[PDB]
Design a protein around this motif. Structure first.
Motif, PDB file in Angstrom:
ATOM      1  N   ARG A 273      14.452 -17.025  12.424  1.00 43.86           N
ATOM      2  CA  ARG A 273      15.826 -17.700  12.137  1.00 43.86           C
ATOM      3  C   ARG A 273      16.033 -18.669  12.805  1.00 43.86           C
ATOM      4  NH1 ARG A 273      13.807 -13.908   9.790  1.00 43.86           N
ATOM      5  NH2 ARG A 273      12.912 -15.663   8.887  1.00 43.86           N
ATOM      6  N   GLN A 275      19.147 -21.840  13.569  1.00 39.85           N
ATOM      7  CA  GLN A 275      20.719 -22.561  13.548  1.00 39.85           C
ATOM      8  C   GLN A 275      20.845 -23.831  13.836  1.00 39.85           C
ATOM      9  OE1 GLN A 275      22.131 -20.666  11.552  1.00 39.85           O
ATOM     10  NE2 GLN A 275      22.835 -18.741  12.358  1.00 39.85           N
ATOM     11  N   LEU A 284      16.348 -18.015  16.262  1.00 41.27           N
ATOM     12  CA  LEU A 284      16.715 -16.740  16.696  1.00 41.27           C
ATOM     13  C   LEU A 284      15.507 -15.883  15.913  1.00 41.27           C
ATOM     14  CD1 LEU A 284      18.782 -15.563  18.502  1.00 41.27           C
ATOM     15  CD2 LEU A 284      19.897 -14.563  16.199  1.00 41.27           C
ATOM     16  N   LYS A 286      14.749 -12.268  13.698  1.00 43.55           N
ATOM     17  CA  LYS A 286      15.358 -11.267  12.801  1.00 43.55           C
ATOM     18  C   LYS A 286      15.835 -10.445  13.333  1.00 43.55           C
ATOM     19  CE  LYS A 286      15.846  -9.982   8.222  1.00 43.55           C
ATOM     20  NZ  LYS A 286      16.301 -10.585   7.110  1.00 43.55           N
ATOM     21  N   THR A 289      18.825 -10.813  15.674  1.00 45.01           N
ATOM     22  CA  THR A 289      19.937 -10.990  14.521  1.00 45.01           C
ATOM     23  C   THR A 289      20.445  -9.629  14.421  1.00 45.01           C
ATOM     24  OG1 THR A 289      19.096 -12.912  13.657  1.00 45.01           O
ATOM     25  CG2 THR A 289      20.935 -12.237  12.724  1.00 45.01           C
ATOM     26  N   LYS A 293      24.316  -8.142  15.332  1.00 43.41           N
ATOM     27  CA  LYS A 293      25.083  -7.213  14.259  1.00 43.41           C
ATOM     28  C   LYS A 293      25.333  -5.939  14.756  1.00 43.41           C
ATOM     29  CE  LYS A 293      24.636  -7.842  10.069  1.00 43.41           C
ATOM     30  NZ  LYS A 293      24.333  -8.118   8.590  1.00 43.41           N
TER      31      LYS A 293
ATOM     32  N   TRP B  32      21.700 -18.101   9.417  1.00 40.36           N
ATOM     33  CA  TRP B  32      20.301 -18.426   9.787  1.00 40.36           C
ATOM     34  C   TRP B  32      19.457 -18.823   8.863  1.00 40.36           C
ATOM     35  CZ3 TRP B  32      23.776 -14.755  11.058  1.00 40.36           C
ATOM     36  CH2 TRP B  32      24.117 -14.506  12.373  1.00 40.36           C
TER      37      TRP B  32
END
Lengths: 489, 163, 107
Positions: A273, A275, A284, A286, A289, A293, B32
């Motif tokens: 990932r 950004q 980042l 997964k 991430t 969360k 993302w």
DNA sequence: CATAATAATAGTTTTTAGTTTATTGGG
DNA sequence: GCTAATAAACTAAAAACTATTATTATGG
């Protein structure tokens, strides 16, 4: 908890089912077919976890598993289908009646014990769990037992047998509706719905099971086993099914990542990932991430008790739900929860808690409004006692509005519209409207699945009327309208 | 964004009112984006869906020959996008009309859904609409009734009855 | 195999239950080598119109194909050969067919 | 280091949180 | 005076109930 509900249709076919029956309209057969077609449509739009069957007693060419006399089975226990609808509608109206006579005839001898035999056999045929079983039987005979009493005794014995098994049968007046002139003999051990079945209300789904059995942790020591129960869900059309144009074949959809740089394929593990912020390309993982969360374990950590004054109508979020104790892995929860619920007159102060419905999701603070036990005199418990799952909006959930200010208006206009709205009173009913789009979609489906010429356009109560409220209010809406220079351009 | 709609009651009352989003679940715009680990490039990441039939060699089929279907009872009925569009229908324009009023006791929070707190203001530079709205607000305050309205965001949005 | 000419040509057999059952018409078309498809397509030469339905109404609305009565199909099958287009089996037709008829018919 | 066993693991379906289409939007 | 924060699907959804099969604590 799963389980299929079964309803079997039995109708006479010997001599009295194709007659005027002291009328000039169609025979009982025609609107009996209409009624069973309506219930087919209602079941199809309602739920596909149920089975239905059609059997006729009085038969010239017998066809059934046990091959008795005067027993014909058209459709066995099965989920309703479009081909079933076509098969049923082939024998509707006068043309359907004469086709039925051509291929089936009429005028055999009824055998009620044989009917119960074949219906019990049909119930034995299904291999699914039978949550509920029901038999309906409509005929013009209030007491077809002028024949040998041995048949009546055998029918009574078989009725007792199926009652012991759990089978229930239904019969109601067809020859002379109203007057309690029906069931001269069947009133012994067997206990108008014509309009109800003919109304064929559809576009209603049915709940199968609850969800989210969570723990009420008042502290780090004591917990209470409860289950969050839904009461309202935003219904929508079933998702489209991708199909082949030529063959109407289901398509094995196959989506994947890819690279044009080398033509190979990327695994879900090596795709990271990313950004963009400021002057850096933030990268980042997964799993990282998912952990982001994640905040804590699912549960209901009691935060305190807040008086039922902070809640405001203008402060609202995703729909509130219902909470009921569920003593499956913690015992004593039900009794304590019930003790809390009954003590609500003093407990007007609402409980405060932070809610984590599932794993690895940020929690939202949710107040707990004690629901009441609104029992009805008809012994109907509407909204049993519990807690409302009202979501508390965060600071970032409010969008800033312009600070334009307005001062109080004149009271004479206030009074005139007070009279206007008092005269124009609408008795609100909670279950009085259906979404036009969804019901229209259902009409399209039921239409563009048979050989229907044109679809039916069901009239909805959502559409505002043009003058009915105007005449319900009169012309005073314009007579009292004394506003100078209406904003109309 | 302002939602200037003609608040229609009966056939004469037409009030210009603009709606605004006040309370809503704030959502982050940035998400993302996927890049390859060893190059951090989204240009070498091709996300595509392959459609194939239930074949031994799973023969691929195009996207133009797809057709929508729906599990209708014990069968599936095929629809096309133009067909499903022409068969469906909805009211057009900004549909915001009051269907009447009832006691506030009839409605309870235990039947609340949606996630939008749509605050409604008056029109712009039209004090007649503003004073009419203020008078109506005070009238509802005095009588303690509730307003039932069939709300549609626009012609395209699905109709939604609400309070 | 009856007429290899009708091969390589796709026929939208989407309503074959006008009077005769649809499978019989499909099998006879296969005997003429036509390609049976249940939905219209750009390569589909024509759409067979059997029972009038809402889908038939869509096909009429969607000026993409031709709405042909089985009468032309019946004539083609009885003669075991192609039958010229007589503008009486037609309901809604493509602009190309409109121009073709305007060429071979006045109005 | 065997066999009339035994059970604590799995596996199908309901429903929310992810993202694309599309329309008011200037230096 | 050419760059909309809209909300139809985006995309593939951390779900239990009710149904069977692999381990053993033990006869041997």
């Amino acid at each position: 908890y799963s389980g299929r509900d079964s309803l079997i249709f039995l109708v006479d076919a010997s001599k009295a089912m194709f007659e005027s029956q002291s009328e000039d309209e169609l025979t009982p057969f025609d609107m009996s077919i209409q009624c069973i077609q309506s219930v087919y449509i209602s079941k199809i739009i309602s739920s596909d976890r149920d089975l239905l069957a059609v059997v006729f007693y009085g038969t010239e060419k017998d066809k059934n598993s046990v091959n008795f006399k005067n027993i014909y089975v058209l459709q066995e226990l099965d989920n309703p289908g479009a081909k079933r609808i076509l098969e049923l509608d082939q024998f509707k109206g006068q043309q359907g009646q004469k086709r039925f006579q051509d291929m089936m005839g009429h005028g055999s001898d009824y055998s009620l014990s044989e009917v119960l035999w074949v219906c019990a056999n049909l119930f034995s045929d299904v291999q699914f769990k039978m949550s509920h079983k029901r038999i309906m039987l409509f005929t013009n005979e209030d007491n077809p037992h002028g024949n040998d009493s041995a048949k009546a005794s055998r029918a009574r014995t078989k009725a007792g047998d199926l009652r012991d098994t759990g089978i229930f049968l239904d019969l109601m007046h067809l020859k002379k509706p109203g007057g309690f002139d029906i069931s001269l003999f069947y009133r012994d051990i067997i206990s108008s719905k014509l309009e109800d079945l003919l109304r064929k209300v559809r576009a209603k789904e049915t709940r199968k099971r609850a969800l989210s059995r969570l723990k009420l942790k008042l502290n780090k020591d004591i917990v209470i086993s409860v289950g969050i129960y839904n009461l309202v869900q935003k219904a929508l059309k079933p998702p489209p099914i991708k199909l082949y144009r030529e063959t109407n074949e289901p398509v094995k959809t196959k989506t994947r990542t890819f690279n044009t740089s080398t033509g190979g394929l990327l695994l879900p593990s090596d795709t990271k990932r990313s950004q963009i912020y400021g002057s850096r390309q933030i990268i980042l993982e997964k799993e990282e991430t998912e952990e982001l969360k994640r905040f804590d374990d699912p549960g209901l950590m009691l935060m305190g008790f807040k008086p039922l004054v902070l809640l405001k109508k203008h402060h609202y979020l995703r729909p509130s739900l219902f909470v009921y104790p569920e003593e499956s892995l913690v015992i004593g929860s039900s009794t304590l929860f019930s003790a809390l619920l009954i003590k609500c007159l003093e407990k007007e102060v609402a409980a405060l808690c932070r809610y984590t419905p599932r794993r690895n999701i940020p929690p939202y603070f949710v107040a707990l409004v004690p629901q009441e036990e609104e029992l009805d005199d008809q012994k109907i418990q509407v909204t049993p006692p519990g807690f409302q799952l009202v979501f508390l909006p965060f600071a970032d959930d409010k969008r800033k509005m312009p600070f334009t200010e307005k001062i109080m208006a004149t009271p004479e206009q206030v009074g005139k519209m007070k009279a206007i709205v008092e005269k124009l009173r609408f008795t609100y009913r909670s279950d009085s409207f259906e979404n036009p789009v969804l019901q229209q979609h259902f009409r399209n489906l039921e239409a563009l699945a048979l050989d229907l010429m044109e679809p039916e356009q069901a009239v909805d109560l959502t559409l505002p009327k043009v003058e009915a409220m105007n005449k319900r209010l009169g012309s005073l809406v314009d007579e009292f309208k004394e506003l100078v220079y209406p904003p109309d351009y | 964004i302002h939602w200037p709609c003609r608040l229609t009651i009966g056939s004469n009352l037409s009030i210009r009112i603009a709606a605004y989003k006040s309370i809503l679940q704030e959502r982050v715009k940035k998400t993302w984006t996927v890049v390859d680990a060893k190059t951090l490039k989204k240009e070498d990441i091709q996300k595509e869906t392959v459609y194939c039939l239930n074949d031994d060699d799973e023969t691929e089929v195009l996207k133009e020959d797809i057709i929508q279907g729906f599990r209708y009872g014990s069968d599936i009925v095929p629809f096309s996008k133009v067909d499903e569009e022409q068969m469906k229908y909805k009211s057009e324009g900004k549909c915001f009309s009051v269907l009447g009023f009832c006691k506030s006791s009839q409605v309870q929070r235990r039947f609340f859904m949606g996630n939008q707190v749509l605050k409604v203001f008056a029109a712009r530079d039209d004090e007649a609409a503003a004073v009419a709205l203020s008078s109506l607000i005070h009238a509802l305050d005095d009588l303690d009734m509730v307003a039932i309205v069939r709300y549609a965001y626009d012609k395209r949005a699905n109709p939604q009855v609400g309070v | 195999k009856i007429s290899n000419i009708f091969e390589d040509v796709e026929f939208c057999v989407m309503s074959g239950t006008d009077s005769q059952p649809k499978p019989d018409l499909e099998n006879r078309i296969a005997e003429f080598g036509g390609y049976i498809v249940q939905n219209p397509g750009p390569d589909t030469y024509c759409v067979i119109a059997g029972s009038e339905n809402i889908r038939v109404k869509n096909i009429i609305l969607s000026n993409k194909h031709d709405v042909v009565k089985p009468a032309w199909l019946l004539e083609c099958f009885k003669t075991k050969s192609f039958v010229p287009w007589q503008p009486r089996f037609m309901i809604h037709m493509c602009p190309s067919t409109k121009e073709h008829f305007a060429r071979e018919y006045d109005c």
